[PDB]
């Protein structure tokens with residue numbers, strides 16, 4: 001799986017250990033080994049949410065399976081909780097796009113996961 | 115909705131009011147309430163379009179519905195027009211990917227929109 | 229087609245000619261004229277793959293058709309080979325998400341490809 005967060009929060013406000021924490025929490029939440037979890041944080045962005053430039057985050061989680069109605073609700077509680085706690089972004093200023101990827105449409109290690 | 119534009123145009127060439135104009139005009143075009151519209155501009159990017167590094171843009175628009183043949187043509191005209199007038203980017207050097215997201219696959223405020 | 233690579237490799241380790249090489253090789257692989265190929269490289273990113281900060285890349289390839297099992301395997305071998313040779317990224321530290329875009333869902337030059 002792959003989690004990306006884009007945010008206007010400054011680089012200095014991203015805690016040491018944030019990428020590791022996301023990796024571990026996502027490994028546990030998706031039930032996949034941490035070796036397959038990729039995380040990407042992009043601070044200092046020029047963005048707005050509802051016309052305001054207060055802290056916000058625009059995010060995506062891609063996974064081959066483990067994406068669905070209840071699971072996505074659970075990921076959203078988890079990830080909004082982490083963004084609130086670690087980056088001080090209000091949950092109602094977070095968007096997360098979830099993508100259930102077909103294995104044939106994910107490239108890795110010179111091939112795909114098909 | 116979520117609108118993102120990545121461009122090789124320098125930050126200094128992005129005018130004051132650009133995120134606000136995007137927010138307002140997308141609210142107009144999509145019908146969506148402006149308080150739920152998020153916008154993101156990423157200048158100074160290392161990119162080429164057709165092998166050339168003249169000004170260009172790669173964009174996305176994600177929305178729960180309001181995506182379709184006619185609506186996307188309307189959005190493209192609006193958005194290319196905005197990038198041409200505001201960023202001096204030729205419309206034939208812009209790509210916009212449109213995504214009709216299932217409400218269950220959009221996280222917000224500790225849950226999803228389903 | 230549009231190809232995006234996000235990487236923690238620093239800008240100075242991206243060799244001159246890289247965007248043109250991606251442009252030309254993707255034109256050949258997809259059987260599409262290079263005028264249609266857009267490429268975007270984003271170095272210096274804060275990212276981890278498997279909880280490690282060793283060089284890695286998170287990429288996407290969007291195309292209107294020419295996406296599928298065998299094609300995506302071929303694209304992956306091509307693109308991992310390029311990232312390994314040029315950016316010194318191990319192939320098993322690369323994810324490429326493939327998207328088969330519907331012509332109606334790609335904006336360009338004030339309209340869409342529909």
Ligand SMILES: COCCOc1ccc2nc(-c3cn(-c4ccc(O)cc4)nn3)ccc2c1
Pocket residue numbers: 095096097115116146147150176177178179215220227
């Ligand atoms: C008085 O208004 C009551 C609330 O009405 C609405 C109507 C449409 C809405 N539409 C949305 C919405 C959010 N998106 C969306 C946002 C981000 C994204 O990555 C993908 C889709 N698309 N639509 C959210 C809240 C809404 C609330």
